Ligand binder design. Structure first.
Ligand SMILES: Nc1ncnc2c1ncn2[C@@H]1O[C@H](COP(=O)(O)OP(=O)(O)OP(O)(O)=S)[C@@H](O)[C@H]1O
Ligand SMILES: Nc1ncnc2c1ncn2[C@@H]1O[C@H](COP(=O)(O)OP(=O)(O)OP(O)(O)=S)[C@@H](O)[C@H]1O
Ligand SMILES: Nc1ncnc2c1ncn2[C@@H]1O[C@H](COP(=O)(O)OP(=O)(O)OP(O)(O)=S)[C@@H](O)[C@H]1O
Ligand SMILES: [Mg+2]
Ligand SMILES: [Mg+2]
Ligand SMILES: [Mg+2]
Lengths: 25, 580, 189
């Protein structure tokens, strides 16, 4: 019997960034 | 105004610890300040090496006067990035605050700005389209060279964040700082010792300071040598200050340092207390009282532990690595399970039958970074870290793939294993007991002849074939388990009967068994090829089975008073079944 | 937990990096040791060095309540540290300390509670007690080598069978009053 082959699974990375505000006056 | 702090003024009141050594690095940093180009020094180093002390310590030397005449009059300021962003609510606040500070420095040309963790300003405050990066604001001034600033960063941060900013990187001149040697670290403690001594009102011994730098580096491997030693020194002072009455410990002896390094490193301490000496010495019958026979197996386990606690042990290898082979039903695993209970330490079990495939190794050491299973982590590394002093049990090791054996080579020879996160697991104090079933087929096999031959040698050949010589050269001992003798079975029967009594005690039933009945069960269930496991079946069918019918639906609901006897006429057991 | 609390008091009495970190598995009484330290101080069964001290629990959710504008978190967090430095006899308890590592970053900045506290922990100006699980400590807290160095990892081990029955006996008066029932000596065992 031929040897088995394993397949890896790569997870993508994406994140959300907050936003600070600066009033003019 | 209030964002920065004049480190030179702080030194005048003793707010900065003194510097010891680091002459080569200080000269390098001072030289980088004087040069016309690339005047901004940077101090890349590992956490704890002392890079921050060098930047702040420079001010201490200036006030002292032990610096060159060119660097004799220079104000050193420490930038607090947190204070810059404190009131930066309205637009233009960051520009005014940052520009106002730079104006005072460029006009003077003598003041120098020390910014710790300069990688933080690379992503300074930006809210809506302003894109006012602190690096961009200071970039033009650094290019001309009117103002010079000192920086500090880690290797990771310098490469992950600071290297990305090529414009800043070219202006800054990296200075590599490395942890001092053991001989140099003791001098540092001697210089810092008076400050710690005054705070704790103690006096560290010259011998004790040396042991802190040697014991910590030997056992504590999660921190660099300069801070690692200071932690032991600082913590030892507090332990002596918290004495019960009148501060009995007015000086920190070597013994105190050893106790401080044992608790910090989660390892057994030296000069084992009398409480532990009793159980260690008494561990000659407790194991023999539960696991009968196989005395040589118990001695190897107890001797390896005694040697480790006594102080005579391998420098980087575990306390003991053993391979338990033999027939089925022998106490290969029971002696290991009962060893942790005798010592009162956590038992780490790992059925190696689950690791038959090569790719299954990922759950032991952990998946690589960027994978779905990276967060889960390794099972062996985490267990060892949580319980450094424990009994590891790799049951059914023969079933595992040969790749798994390679993982244990480093554990036995080096005692350090690297996981996905990079943490080093300490195997110095963990016991390694891996039971194997290799060659068991030949053990129960009967020779083709009148006289049955001993297949113990043939079984060892299978163990030598499956395990390469490298694996067998790192194991402290290979203890073949011999078959259970007739007299030994009598002891095994008593053990199972005791367990039955404990089970009946919960229900409120007692059990009395005659000596003749015990001998009958032994000869009936005795099987040299099947070990002691069949003895539990005889007890189940002859003792537990009748009692179960009476316990559920019978007179033996409570009170017990059961008696068991065998009549020679019928050659069968007699059950009392007293209601009580 | 005399051994655990004694080591914590020893770390809190250090000159520098006096910031213990109660690392242990969930359910081993990490918060109990930190929160119970205050209960012991009021009762009086603590060393004289630890008496007269006030322990405060930090709610990271309340700091970021109205931090819409830039610098609200920095000013709010920095002001809190000033109070501790003034009295110089107060301790801060931050449960789930792994969270503050990344809190406060607005869009792409590294300015956070970790960097804002870092220079104040290595100098010994303030004392902070931490509590976090092994998984969080190994995967998140251990990543920041600088912050990890300042914190002295104090391991907490699961108690034995005998050590647990005395704990229930001490807690039993609080549970009995809630349900208005009584527990027997055999029920606890
Ligand atoms: N010459 C010295 N060498 C080493 N340690 C010293 C020296 N002088 C004083 N120390 C003490 O040991 C510490 C050395 O490490 P620090 O300079 O504090 O580390 P650091 O640069 O803040 O660390 P990170 O991880 O980079 S934030 C000093 O803060 C003092 O407590
Ligand atoms: N020498 C012994 N003394 C007392 N009980 C024993 C002894 N040997 C085996 N037993 C009992 O028989 C069972 C053995 O269980 P384990 O030790 O886990 O078996 P094992 O050694 O893994 O088995 P194999 O078949 O050799 S892989 C338990 O019920 C033990 O209590
Ligand atoms: N020595 C003790 N005395 C009294 N209660 C204790 C003790 N040790 C543990 N506990 C109990 O343990 C619980 C408190 O610890 P936990 O609720 O596990 O908090 P924690 O350790 O911060 O949790 P996580 O999930 O790990 S953040 C309460 O049920 C306490 O009554
Ligand atoms: Mg630093
Ligand atoms: Mg086995
Ligand atoms: Mg909690």
């Amino acid at each position: 019997g031929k040897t088995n082959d394993w397949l890896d699974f790569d997870q993508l990375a994406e994140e959300k960034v907050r936003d600070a505000l600066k009033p003019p006056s | 105004e209030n964002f920065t702090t004049n480190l030179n003024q702080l030194a005048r009141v003793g707010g900065i610890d003194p510097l010891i050594g680091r002459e080569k690095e200080l000269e390098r940093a001072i030289q980088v300040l004087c040069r016309r180009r690339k005047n901004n020094p940077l101090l890349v180093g590992e956490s704890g090496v002392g890079k921050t002390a060098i930047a702040e310590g420079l001010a201490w030397r200036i006030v002292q006067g032990d610096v060159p005449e060119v660097m004799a009059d220079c104000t050193i300021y420490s930038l607090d990035i947190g204070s810059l962003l404190a009131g930066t609510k309205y637009r233009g606040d960051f520009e005014k605050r940052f520009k106002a500070l730079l104006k005072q420095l460029e006009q003077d040309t003598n003041s120098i700005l020390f910014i710790d963790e300069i990688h933080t300003i690379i992503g300074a405050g930006a809210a809506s389209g302003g894109q006012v990066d602190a690096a961009n604001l200071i970039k033009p001034l650094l290019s001309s060279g009117k103002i010079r600033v000192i920086g500090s960063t880690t290797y990771q941060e310098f490469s992950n964040i600071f290297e990305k900013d090529r414009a800043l990187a070219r202006r800054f001149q990296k200075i590599d700082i490395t942890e001092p040697s053991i001989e140099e670290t003791v001098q540092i403690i001697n210089g810092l010792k008076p400050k710690y001594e005054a705070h704790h009102d103690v006096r560290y011994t010259a011998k004790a300071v040396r042991a802190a730098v040697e014991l910590a580096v030997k056992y504590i491997n999660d921190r660099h040598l300069p801070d690692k030693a200071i932690d032991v020194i600082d913590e030892a002072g507090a332990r002596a200050r918290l004495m019960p009455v009148s501060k009995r410990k007015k000086t920190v002896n070597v013994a105190d340092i050893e106790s401080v390094v044992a608790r910090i490193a989660r390892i057994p301490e030296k000069s084992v207390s009398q409480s532990d000496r009793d159980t260690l010495k008494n561990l000659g019958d407790r194991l023999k009282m539960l696991v009968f026979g196989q005395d040589k197996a118990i001695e190897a386990l107890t001797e390896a532990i005694k040697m480790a606690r006594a102080g005579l042990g391998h420098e980087h290898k575990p306390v003991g690595s053993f391979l338990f082979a033999g027939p089925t039903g022998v106490g290969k695993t029971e002696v290991t399970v009962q060893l942790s209970k005798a010592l009162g330490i956590e038992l780490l079990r790992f059925d190696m039958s689950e690791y038959m495939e090569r790719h299954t190794v990922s759950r032991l050491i952990g998946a690589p970074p960027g994978y779905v299973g990276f967060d889960q982590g390794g099972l062996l590394t985490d267990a060892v870290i949580k319980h450094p002093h424990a009994v590891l049990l790799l049951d059914e090791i023969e079933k595992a793939h040969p790749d798994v054996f390679n993982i244990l080579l480093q554990v036995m020879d080096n005692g350090t294993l690297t996981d996905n996160n990079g943490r080093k697991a300490d195997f110095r104090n963990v016991v390694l007991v891996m039971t194997t079933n290799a060659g068991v087929r030949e053990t129960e096999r009967k020779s083709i002849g009148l006289i049955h031959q001993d297949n113990s040698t043939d079984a060892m050949e299978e163990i030598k074939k499956i395990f390469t010589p490298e694996f067998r050269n790192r194991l402290d001992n290979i203890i073949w388990f011999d078959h259970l003798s007739t007299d030994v079975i009598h002891q095994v029967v008593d053990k199972f009967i005791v367990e039955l009594q404990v089970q009946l005690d919960q229900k409120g039933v007692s059990l009395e068994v005659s000596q003749e009945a015990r001998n009958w069960l032994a000869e009936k269930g005795y099987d040299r090829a099947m070990g002691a496991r069949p003895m539990a079946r005889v007890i189940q069918d002859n003792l537990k089975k009748p009692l179960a019918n009476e316990l559920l639906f019978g007179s033996l609901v409570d009170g017990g008073q059961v008696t068991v006897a065998l009549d020679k006429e019928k050659n069968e057991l007699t059950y009392g079944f007293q209601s009580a």
